[PDB]
Design a protein around this ligand. Structure first.
Ligand SMILES: Nc1ncnc2c1ncn2[C@@H]1O[C@H](COP(=O)(O)OP(=O)(O)NP(=O)(O)O)[C@@H](O)[C@H]1O
Lengths: 93, 229
């Protein structure tokens, strides 16, 4: 999740397209797996998105600062003992 | 992760019903089942039902604490975790005896106060957070409030299916039940009865991207508090 965050993102873009984008990114970058969008919302609130956190008129806590990407668009904004280590060394060891 | 309950294997369990299960090849005596049930998780419980039969034998609550070894102050919902409640404090006989005493005392209190009826006892935090969860987990209302403010009915069910998969998760639905719940939902001011013998709605908008329109004890809460408690 954080790899996708600080790999593809640097309007509010809603959130369904966001979850689908993360799903396809994970399928391509990592493995083909289905993600339940509610979970992705919870970890998105848990991830670094509070600065982008916003609200929608349809009663939807929404995001901001969104950078869309679907192709090659790129960025588009200690020590050692003498001879006895088993001697346990001093208290710091 | 979060899983759905599918409303099977639940009402039967919630109700104390005797059952001649087990002994598939043979036959195990019908045994009466009577056990208090508790379900907790770090994730969400997906529910898929609307019948009064369901949503009536259920109770919901949400915790408001968290224990950690770095107890940052200024947050009342955070305390220094004790890495000792688990590795010990369980095998000690005396603590178990004390807990058993607490349980028997509470059962005696319940029996002498509410005559054994757990439904009659009143908790405002409960039966309010529960109906708050009821306001959720009912995705049809969310779809209606998100996408619609005659288009027939196949379009409606397909729109609900695509919305659900996108908003929640790719899941399969049946058009008939969705329609009947639509006449069971807040659509009757729009829903009508066409002369072509096809129940349809009216004033239907299909949005695509953005189309606009109590008390505290002295020091002993186990004193049962006053009668309202
Ligand atoms: N009232 C309390 N005072 C102090 N420590 C507590 C208290 N209640 C719980 N703890 C500690 O906080 C932790 C409770 O977390 P807990 O819910 O058991 O974790 P979990 O996610 O369920 N799985 P696990 O971390 O293995 O226990 C344990 O380490 C307890 O010892």
């Amino acid at each position: 999740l954080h790899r996708f965050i600080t790999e593809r993102v640097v309007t509010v873009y809603n959130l369904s397209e966001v979850v689908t984008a993360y799903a396809e990114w994970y399928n391509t970058n990592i493995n083909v797996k289905r993600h339940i969008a509610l979970e992705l919302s919870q970890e998105l609130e848990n991830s670094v998105l509070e600065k982008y956190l916003q609200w929608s008129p349809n009663k939807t806590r929404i995001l901001k600062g969104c950078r869309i990407l679907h192709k090659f668009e790129t960025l588009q904004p200690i020590c050692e003992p003498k001879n006895k280590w088993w001697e346990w060394s001093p208290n710091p060891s | 992760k979060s899983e759905v309950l599918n409303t099977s294997r639940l009402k039967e369990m919630v109700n104390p019903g005797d059952v001649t299960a087990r002994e598939l090849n043979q036959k195990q005596e019908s045994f009466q089942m009577t056990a208090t049930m508790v379900a907790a998780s770090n994730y969400n419980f997906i529910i898929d039902t609307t019948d009064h039969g369901t949503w009536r034998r259920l109770r919901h609550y949400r915790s408001k604490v968290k224990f950690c070894h770095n107890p940052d102050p200024s947050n009342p919902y955070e305390k220094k975790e004790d890495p000792r409640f688990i590795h010990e404090y369980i095998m000690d006989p005396d603590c178990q005896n004390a807990f058993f005493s607490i349980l028997v005392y509470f059962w005696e209190k319940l029996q002498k106060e509410y005559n054994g009826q757990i439904k009659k006892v009143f908790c405002p935090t409960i039966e309010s957070e529960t109906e708050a969860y009821r306001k959720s987990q009912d995705t049809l209302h969310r779809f209606i409030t998100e996408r619609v403010v005659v288009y027939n009915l196949s379009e409606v069910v397909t729109a609900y299916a695509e919305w659900y998969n996108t908003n929640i998760n790719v899941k399969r639905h049946i058009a008939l039940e969705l329609s009947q719940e639509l006449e069971n939902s807040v659509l009757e001011k729009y829903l009508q009865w066409s002369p072509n013998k096809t129940r349809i709605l009216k004033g239907c908008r299909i949005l695509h991207k953005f189309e606009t329109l109590i008390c505290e004890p002295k020091n002993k809460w186990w004193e049962w508090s006053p009668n309202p408690s």
